[PDB]
Structure 1
Amino acid sequence: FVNQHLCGSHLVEALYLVCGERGFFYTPKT
């Protein structure tokens, strides 16, 4: 696999593909 530059909704698309049915948590800094 290659490294990623992912911002905004593109990061959540990447989490969805990586994790599939395992699900994931999206946890930005506040």
Structure 2
Amino acid sequence: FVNQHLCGSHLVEALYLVCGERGFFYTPKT
């Protein structure tokens, strides 16, 4: 796999693909 430059909604699409069925937590800085 290649490295990623991912901002905004593009990151949660990547998380979705990686994790699939497992689900994920999206936890940005405040």
After the TM superposition, which parts of structure 1 deviate over 3 Å for at least 4 consecutive aligned residues? none
Q: Taking structure 1 as the reference length, what is the TM-score of the superposition? A: 0.99
Q: Taking structure 2 as the reference length, what is the TM-score of the superposition? A: 0.99
Consecutive unaligned residues of structure 1, counting only runs of 5 or more, are none
CA RMSD of the aligned region, Å?
0.1
Aligned pair count reads 30
Consecutive unaligned residues of structure 2, counting only runs of 5 or more, are none
Alignment identity in percent? 100
What do the CA deviations read for 1:1-30 (whole angstroms, capped 9, x no partner)? Answer: 000000000000000000000000000000
CA–CA separation in structure 1 for the residues paired with 2:17 and 2:9:
13
